[PDB]
Design a protein around this ligand. Structure first.
Ligand SMILES: *[C@@](C)(CO)[C@](*)(O)[C@H](CC(C)C)NC(=O)[C@H](Cc1ccccc1)NC(=O)[C@H](CC(C)C)NC(=O)[C@H](CCc1ccccc1)NC(=O)CN1CCOCC1
Ligand SMILES: [Mg+2]
Lengths: 244, 212, 240, 233, 222, 231, 235, 195
């Protein structure tokens, strides 16, 4: 019958590893680098677009940074199509929580549920896993500013500063070097860009090959604002830090 | 039916009648309305005969499976809740059941739970259930004290059923007595109202309304 | 639905998928359980290749199943969440029907049953997780410590360890733990647990987690400084 | 839940010494309207059974198809289909009785009263009744509808109990049936003069008589009856 | 609107002796004011020395008996030809009846036979499965006529010892098969006189350790 | 070789190897013999044990008062098929008030076994059956094979060394067929037939298993001291 | 790969035959049937000295009149026991009586072959089902994952089964007392066990008509072990 | 099931619930506690159809307790009341709806404020300074309109509550066998034993 053609996506290796999860992570390691940095007064999300073409429409484009709700955003690394499936699920889950409790969803709860969905694809169903790693950046009134990451295994962890995608080894060493706990958002913005600038496979880091976002309490009195940076705004912040 | 069970110093007394009716037709005078679930658990039955019988016989099977699985006798609370959760699933379907789950365990002590077919579940010291419950309440409440002896408590339970058996047209036949202690339930005999009434009348001097 | 029998017997009488799930447990970070005279202590390793972590929000290794029972584990982290969730639901379901919280043996038996079901169900792979379940039964002061594993077998332990380099720490516990006289106090039990992890861990900084469970739903997690005091005390006594 | 539309009236039957007789008129009534006049309500199954059906005609036609299909199904992989493993009256009846009760139990009955008349392989007379409720019974005489009230009394004067069956000939038995049909024509407002009659004998086999008519009727005395009490003209 | 139930009349009667048991029932089958059959048996030998009758709505009665007979057959297949005891049969019948609790078999069921000590046994059931072992039970249309007579003659109710000032009751004792059949025949002739749905014939099934014997008696046909 | 992975695959020569491997399970099974006259039909079965401490595996199963079979191969598969026969015999009784014909019984088993040989996932039955019965057309003996092939016979045998008993019956055909109105002599002929399939072992009291059905004889099984007569 | 319900060229189900190999790796379990009762005994086999041996539950109650001992992948037995207990209690509900030991075993063995492509693989555990009923008296059954069950006068399953079975062949006779059977299980267990037999690493149980199924205490078994050693030294 | 009241004061929420359980012409019990603790600082009283009330209360209690364990965090009274409302809002369009009316009294630890929510069986939620279900409201609302002040203490609230119970005992047709009073504040939930 059909048994002949089954790849058996949800099995263990002799060493106790999940083949498909490992190979999905290998796929993600070639994707554009994404960095998340958490400061005391906000969070930074920076991501490098995959080898841009000059005729690509840059201003009306969304590849890396997506909005889940007013308080939570994600940076993507891997298959974009896969990420969008998961993003719409995450957006719906957030609205279900708001509908049920009349309160915005706590960041971890959203992260856990999305990570549980990924876990399911590794244990049952016989389908391939989602070739996607997220960096979750969000805020709630319990833990404040939070950074998380999830990967195809469905395992998630919390971070002060983290990178996903390509050159994470080199990127994580640089973040570990210059990061400190009493850091501000404007400093974190500078760290994020400097890290990408050194770890990039491109010749020089430019505005058209970047997506950028911040989550500050920079709005008026005790409320959070999400800022998805425009092309011109990235151009300005890149000059202001002295990269171009 | 008339059934009661009350808690006291020396454990629990349980007393029931034995009549079964189909309208005004007296169908039986020898029905067993105390179901022996295990050596430490009793169940009273009032209402639809088949409903009570079938489901309390089923309850005993569920309690047996509990002690096989858990290597421990089921609590009175857990036993009563199995039955109350069962009948609650059938709520609206027309089940007619008025039952009392009486028993002893180490953690609980002597315990009585009233359970009925519309899903009510109540822990308590005294309960009377059935068409003649009010008649039983009248005698039981007016003579009840916590410090009753085992001998006096057994009699009061017997006398309360007799009172209801007399006045309630849909109660009678005979009185079945039980006594529940820390060591388990003890049967205290079947007492035909045919002989018991005249015996009680003469010795007690009560029932002066009746032509002696 | 996906029906494939993934967990099956081999000529030599082994279920390789269950045995490969044990390898995943062997890869996982070390976890240890030691029960004293009036308490149980759950120690857990945290690998130190991960700096820039946020320890406030990162999922803790020890999870409360109910107010009186806790569950730690070794193996796949994502898999453990599914078992913990199921166990937590069953804990509330038990309180609802039996009007009494679960015993530690019952909760273990349930979790172990779930693990077993995934070893002979079509379309699914076994859980790459072994758990240490510890706590105190309702209205009881006798400490309980159980272990489960992917195959579904479970058993009670005076003291036990699972995960990577667990055979080293099990060797330590086997000579240092006395059946006739277990750790009489909380301090003695925690110290023995920390000592056992210090055979394997590396550094006693933010690598060791300790959680103490006591009777009547008295569970508390130790902080860095509190754990560090045990590490400082043990090393000074060692130099002799 | 149904209501019958086009209906058939009485089916009458009885046992005699060597076999059974069954009869039913050829009418398909539509309420008070005597709508259809060429309706055959006796349906032979093989050469040893006749099923007489009253009640709803649409449901009767459904039952015809089932019996027709039953003969076909029995012939499949059956070399003895026209011999030892042929359909018996008892097999045909039990099948119908199973269906009738299953349908009433699903609250969607076949709105009929059925009499299965036949002769078994060992020569024994078979005569049994079944209706929309799945109720079954057997008797030396059986009748449906008005037949139960008027025919049975007349047929029971001939065969009142089991011991009267060997004493009753086919000539006497048929005469009683034909007489009963006349009485029903006098008194049943949903009956017709034309009818069919079937005889299943253990010796001579199945004799199916069509296009019979009620005859030798008494109507002459009507001319003397005037008014409703007083009136002399 | 379609009414799935009907009343086929008739009445049945079970009496238990020391080493025997009888289950009697009239052979008349009716609907409304018409007689369907003067001889339609409704007391059946079901095997394992168990006799059964399900009086009331005949279609449901036949269905039940048919199903219990089948239950006995499969009990042999599944449990190494073990004999189904009368107490086990009774419990099995409870589950058959209660299985249709929300669309009941409209019948009063009685079974008779011998218990595992060899003593006579009669069990009776309501339509939805409540059952009880008794020395004595009448069921069906004329149950209300026959039952109080049985209380008086079988269980000696309201009968005291002469000259004892109503203080000593008439002592209970088992009846002989000859005395029981007298009570059955007198019960049915009395019921035939005063109940229109009872008559035509009486069929008695007697159950001893030797097997199941039958006896038939004529009843008034009006 | 490459065409025996499942039942849904034909070999290049047009063979179904999984069905043939199921047939092989019957040859490993203990011998059982079937034979009939015009009045009676008899099953004789050599039961097998694990060791001296164990019981002897029961080979004969009753399906109805007038029908039953003996098994050879996987016993659980015989239990499934016999249970199916019990239901089909029972369906025929309840619905049509009719004893199921032994020929139809075979047709039903054939069709049930066949469905398992044409579909993916399932497997063929790993057992052979000898069905005897007495119906409206007299005594019958059937041989069921899990390929689906059912065959009506005067006599036969299946299992290990069944060729010996089958040759004997082929010689004795004219004799035993006319054993009418004599149960004990028909059994004797069956016991002598199964004896041609014995090697080193002989027929003992708790080893032999006999069953019989006929004109005025319901299907009954004889084991233990009841078969001591025929040794 | 290959189908789960595939036949080998020899005419056996691959998966059933492989599950039998798993049972040979399991700890030893012995059962002996007498006219005074049936005795069941098992090797606990703790993997480490820190493991509390009293939590090793390889002997199990199904009903008051039926007990069960296991060997092999013991986790697989849980659903088999659950089914057995339900089957036993359910039959008591339907028929107001105890269920036959054979009928109970047959019900358990019906699960065995309900696997394929129902559960994904056969059970990797063999069961010794011991009990008593009014008809056939004291009985001992060996239930395999093949769906087959044999009745036994005595039977050993597990790693030391073939050595123990040969010993049971010589020692068993139809007039064994219960006390003699108890000692015989302990004797044979001590012979095939790796570690030295004591009350902590071995467990005894029995089923009698009077007292029903009972698992022996470690105090009671310890005395039977001491009684066994003295009797062997006495000649 | 009949009388359930609620009064939110300065620093606490006070719930009073009748003790009587009647069926037919018999008071079966006179010490019934018509409330469940959903979380350490949230209490739900209930009244309505027999069986439904407790079944619903415990089902909610289980769900909230499950949430607390999962997140190691206590839901706010507002969040709990929204969850309860949605469950009743689903229920009303079910095959067989829960016929249960509830009051949810809680103390929000983040806001340091007491909160009282009134939810009927239809899923109709309202936050109130004082609330009641059933015929009780027809007496107590007008009484509280007059005597209630927003800045009252817990002791003043209990006196205000005594005034309601007295009025109900005077004018209500049925004997409800007094009330069990419970207080919800910053220190959790406690029962007034002498009322
Ligand atoms: C006191 C005596 C009255 O409340 C007790 O409560 C006892 C309890 C004992 C028996 C456990 N209750 C009864 O006796 C109970 C009263 C009753 C009747 C019907 C519905 C609810 C309560 N009686 C019964 O259950 C009788 C018992 C028989 C006579 C042994 N059973 C019936 O009345 C049956 C079944 C009723 C039924 C319930 C649910 C669905 C369908 C039917 N009905 C009949 O037998 C019908 N009837 C009898 C008279 O002959 C014509 C047919
Ligand atoms: Mg009265």
């Amino acid at each position: 019958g059909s048994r002949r053609y089954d790849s058996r996506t949800t099995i263990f290796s002799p060493e106790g590893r999940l083949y498909q999860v490992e190979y999905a992570l290998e796929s993600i390691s070639h994707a554009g680098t994404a960095i998340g940095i958490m400061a005391s007064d906000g969070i930074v999300l920076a991501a490098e677009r995959k080898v841009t073409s000059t005729l690509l429409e840059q201003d009306t484009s969304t590849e890396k940074l997506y909005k889940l709700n007013d308080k939570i955003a994600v940076a993507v690394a891997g298959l974009t199509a896969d990420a969008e499936i998961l993003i719409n699920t995450a957006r719906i889950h957030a609205q279900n929580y708001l509908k049920t409790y009349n309160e915005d969803i706590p960041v971890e709860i959203l992260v856990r549920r999305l990570s549980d969905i990924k876990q399911g694809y590794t244990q049952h169903g016989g389908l391939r896993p989602f070739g996607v790693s997220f960096i979750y950046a969000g805020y709630d009134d319990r833990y404040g500013y939070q950074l998380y990451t999830s990967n195809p295994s469905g395992n998630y962890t919390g971070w002060k500063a983290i990178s996903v995608g390509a050159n994470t080894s080199a990127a994580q060493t640089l973040l570990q070097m210059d990061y400190k706990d009493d850091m501000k958002v404007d400093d974190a913005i500078e760290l994020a860009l400097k890290t990408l600038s050194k770890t990039t496979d491109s010749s020089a880091l430019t505005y058209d090959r970047l997506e950028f976002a911040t989550i500050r309490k920079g709005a008026n009195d005790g409320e959070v604002y999400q800022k998805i940076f425009k092309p011109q705004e990235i151009k300005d912040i890149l000059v202001k830090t002295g990269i171009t | 039916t008339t059934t009661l069970a009350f808690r006291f110093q020396g454990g629990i007394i349980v007393a029931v009648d034995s009549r079964a009716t189909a309208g005004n037709w007296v169908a039986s005078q020898t029905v067993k309305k105390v179901i022996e679930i295990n050596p430490f658990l009793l169940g009273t039955v009032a209402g639809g005969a088949a409903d009570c019988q079938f489901w309390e016989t089923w309850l005993g099977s569920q309690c047996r499976l509990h002690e096989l699985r858990e290597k421990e006798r089921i609590s009175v609370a857990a036993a009563s809740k199995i039955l109350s959760n069962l009948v609650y699933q059938y709520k609206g379907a027309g089940l007619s059941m008025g039952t009392m789950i009486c028993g002893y365990t180490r953690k609980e002590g002597p315990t009585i739970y009233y359970v009925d077919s519309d899903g009510t579940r109540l822990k308590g010291d005294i309960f009377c259930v059935g068409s003649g419950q009010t008649f039983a309440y009248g005698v039981l409440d007016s003579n009840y004290k916590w410090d009753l002896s085992v001998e006096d408590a057994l009699y009061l339970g017997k006398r309360s059923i007799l009172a209801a058996a007399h006045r309630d047209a849909y109660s009678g036949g005979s009185v079945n007595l039980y006594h529940v202690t820390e060591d388990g339930w003890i049967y205290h005999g079947n007492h035909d109202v045919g002989e018991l009434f005249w015996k009680v009348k003469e010795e007690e001097g009560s029932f002066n309304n009746v032509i002696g | 639905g996906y029906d494939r029998a993934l967990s099956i017997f081999s000529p030599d009488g082994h279920i390789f998928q269950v045995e490969y799930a044990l390898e995943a447990v062997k890869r996982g970070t070390c976890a240890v359980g030691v029960k004293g005279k009036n308490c149980v202590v759950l120690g857990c390793e945290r690998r130190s290749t991960l700096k820039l972590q946020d320890t406030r929000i990162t999922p803790s290794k020890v999870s409360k199943i109910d107010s009186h029972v806790v569950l730690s584990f070794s193996g796949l982290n994502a898999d453990s969440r599914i078992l913990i969730e199921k166990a937590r639901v069953e804990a509330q379901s038990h309180r609802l029907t039996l009007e009494d919280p679960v015993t530690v043996e019952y909760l273990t038996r349930y979790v172990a049953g779930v693990q077993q079901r995934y070893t002979q169900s079509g379309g699914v792979r076994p859980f790459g997780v072994s758990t240490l379940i510890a706590g105190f039964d309702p209205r009881d002061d006798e400490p309980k410590l159980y272990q489960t594993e992917p195959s579904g077998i479970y058993s009670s332990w005076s003291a036990q360890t699972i995960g990577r380099n667990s055979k080293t720490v099990r060797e330590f516990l086997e000579k240092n733990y006395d059946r006739k006289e277990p750790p009489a106090t909380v301090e003695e039990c925690v110290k023995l647990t920390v000592r056992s992890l210090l055979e394997v861990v590396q550094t006693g900084a933010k690598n060791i987690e300790i959680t103490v469970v006591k009777p009547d739903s008295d569970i508390v997690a130790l902080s860095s400084e509190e754990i560090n005091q045990y590490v400082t005390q043990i090393e000074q006594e060692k130099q002799e | 839940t149904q209501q019958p539309i086009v209906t058939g009236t009485s089916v009458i039957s009885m046992k005699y010494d060597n076999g059974v007789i069954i009869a039913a008129d050829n009418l398909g009534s539509y309420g008070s309207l005597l709508r259809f006049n060429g309706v055959e309500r006796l349906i032979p199954v093989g050469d040893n059974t006749v099923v007489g059906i009253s009640g709803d005609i649409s449901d009767m036609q459904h039952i015809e198809r089932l019996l027709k299909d039953l003969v076909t199904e029995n012939a499949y992989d059956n070399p003895l289909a026209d011999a030892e493993e042929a359909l018996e009256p008892s097999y045909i009846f039990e099948y119908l009785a199973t269906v009738m009760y299953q349908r009433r139990s699903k609250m969607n009955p076949l709105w009929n009263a059925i009499i299965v008349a036949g002769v078994q392989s060992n020569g024994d007379q078979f005569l049994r009744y079944v209706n929309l409720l799945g109720v079954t019974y057997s008797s030396p005489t059986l009748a449906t509808g008005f037949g139960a009230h008027m025919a049975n009394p007349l047929l029971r004067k001939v065969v009142d109990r089991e011991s009267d069956i060997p004493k009753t000939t086919v000539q006497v038995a048929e005469e009683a049936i034909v007489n009963a049909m006349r009485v029903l024509y006098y008194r049943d407002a949903r009956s017709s003069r034309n009818f069919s009659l079937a005889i299943i004998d253990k010796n001579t086999g199945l004799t199916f008589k069509k296009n019979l008519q009620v005859e030798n009727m008494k109507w002459d005395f009507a001319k003397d009856i005037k008014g409703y009490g007083t009136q002399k003209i | 609107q379609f009414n799935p139930y009907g009343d086929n009349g008739g009445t049945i009667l079970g009496i238990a002796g020391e080493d025997f048991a009888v289950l009697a029932g009239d052979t008349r089958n009716i609907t409304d004011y018409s007689i369907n059959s003067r001889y339609e048996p409704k007391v059946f030998d079901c095997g394992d020395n168990i006799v059964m009758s399900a009086n009331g709505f005949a279609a449901d009665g036949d269905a039940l008996v048919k199903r219990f007979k089948n239950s006995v057959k499969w009990y042999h297949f599944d449990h190494n030809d073990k004999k189904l005891s009368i107490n086990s049969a009774a419990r099995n019948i409870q589950h058959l009846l209660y299985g249709k609790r929300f669309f009941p078999y409209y019948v009063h069921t009685i079974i008779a036979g011998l218990d595992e000590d060899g003593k006579g046994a009669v069990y009776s059931f309501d339509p939805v499965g409540s059952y009880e072992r008794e020395q004595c039970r009448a069921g069906g249309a004329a149950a209300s006529l026959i039952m109080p007579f049985l209380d008086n003659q079988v269980n000696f109710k309201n009968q005291y010892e002469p000259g004892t000032n109503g203080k000593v009751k008439k002592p209970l004792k088992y009846l002989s098969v000859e005395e029981v059949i007298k009570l059955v025949r007198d019960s049915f002739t009395s019921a035939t006189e005063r109940h229109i749905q009872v008559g035509d014939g009486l069929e008695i099934l007697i159950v001893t350790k030797d097997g199941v014997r039958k006896e038939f008696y004529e009843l008034k046909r009006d | 070789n490459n065409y025996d992975g499942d039942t849904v695959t034909f070999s290049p020569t047009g063979r179904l190897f999984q069905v043939e491997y199921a047939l092989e399970a019957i040859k490993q099974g203990s011998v059982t013999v079937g034979l009939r006259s015009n009045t009676h039909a008899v099953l004789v079965a050599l039961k097998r044990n694990a060791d001296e401490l164990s019981s002897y595996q029961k080979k004969i199963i009753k399906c109805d008062e007038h029908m039953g079979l003996s098994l050879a191969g996987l016993a659980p598969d015989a239990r499934v098929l016999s249970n199916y026969l019990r239901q089909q015999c029972n369906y025929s009784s309840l619905v049509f008030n009719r004893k199921l014909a032994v020929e139809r019984a075979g047709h039903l088993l054939c069709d049930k076994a066949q469905k398992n040989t044409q579909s993916y996932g399932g497997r063929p039955y790993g057992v052979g059956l000898l069905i005897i019965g007495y119906d409206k057309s007299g005594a019958h003996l059937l041989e069921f094979q899990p390929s689906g092939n059912v065959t009506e016979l005067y006599g036969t045998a299946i299992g290990a060394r069944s060729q010996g008993a089958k040759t004997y019956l082929e010689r004795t055909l004219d004799t035993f067929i006319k054993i009418d109105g004599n149960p004990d002599e028909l059994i004797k002929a069956g016991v002598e037939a199964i004896s041609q399939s014995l090697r080193d072992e002989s027929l003992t009291v708790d080893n032999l298993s006999i069953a019989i059905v006929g004109k005025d004889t319901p299907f009954t099984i004889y084991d233990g001291e009841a078969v001591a007569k025929y040794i | 790969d290959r189908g789960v319900s595939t036949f080998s060229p020899e005419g056996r189900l691959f998966q059933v035959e492989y599950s039998l190999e798993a049972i040979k790796l399991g700890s030893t379990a012995i059962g002996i049937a007498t006219k005074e009762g049936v005795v069941l005994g098992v090797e606990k086999r703790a993997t480490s000295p820190l493991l509390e041996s009293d939590s090793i539950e390889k002997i199990v109650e199904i009903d008051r009149h039926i007990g069960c001992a296991m060997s092999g992948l013991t986790a697989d037995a849980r659903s088999m026991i659950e089914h057995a207990r339900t089957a036993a209690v359910t039959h008591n509900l339907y028929y107001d009586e105890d269920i036959n030991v054979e009928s109970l075993t047959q019900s358990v063995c019906d699960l065995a072959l309900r696997f394929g492509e129902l559960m994904s693989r056969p059970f990797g555990v063999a069961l010794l089902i011991a009990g008593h009923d009014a008809d056939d008296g004291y009985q001992l059954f060996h239930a395999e994952p093949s769906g087959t069950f044999y009745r036994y006068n005595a039977k050993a399953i597990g790693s030391g089964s073939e050595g123990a079975q040969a010993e049971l062949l010589n020692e068993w006779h139809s007039s064994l007392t219960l006390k003699e059977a108890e000692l015989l299980v302990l004797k044979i267990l001590k012979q095939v066990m790796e570690e030295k037999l004591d009350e902590n690493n071995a467990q005894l149980s029995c089923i009698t008509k009077q007292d029903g199924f009972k698992i022996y205490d470690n105090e009671k078994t310890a005395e039977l072990i001491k009684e066994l050693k003295e009797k062997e030294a006495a000649e | 099931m009949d009388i359930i009241l609620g009064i939110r004061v300065q620093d606490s929420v006070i719930l009073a619930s009748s003790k009587a359980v009647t069926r037919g012409i018999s008071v079966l019990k006179d010490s019934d506690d018509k409330t469940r603790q959903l979380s350490p600082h949230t209490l739900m009283s209930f009244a309505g159809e027999a069986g439904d009330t407790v079944q619903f209360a415990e089902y909610i209690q289980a769900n909230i307790q499950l949430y607390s364990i999962r997140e190691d965090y206590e839901l706010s009274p507002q969040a709990v009341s929204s969850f309860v409302r949605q469950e009743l809002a689903k229920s009303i369009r079910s095959r067989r709806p829960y016929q249960v009316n509830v009051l949810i009294g809680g103390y929000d630890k983040k806001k340091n404020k007491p909160e009282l929510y009134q939810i009927d069986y239809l899923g109709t939620k309202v936050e109130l300074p004082y609330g009641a279900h059933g015929y009780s409201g027809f007496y107590t609302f007008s009484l509280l309109d007059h005597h209630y002040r927003p800045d009252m203490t817990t002791e003043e609230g209990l006196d205000l509550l005594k005034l309601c119970v007295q009025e109900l005992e005077k004018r209500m047709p049925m004997d409800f066998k007094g009330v069990i009073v419970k207080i919800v504040d910053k220190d959790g939930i406690r029962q007034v034993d002498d009322f």
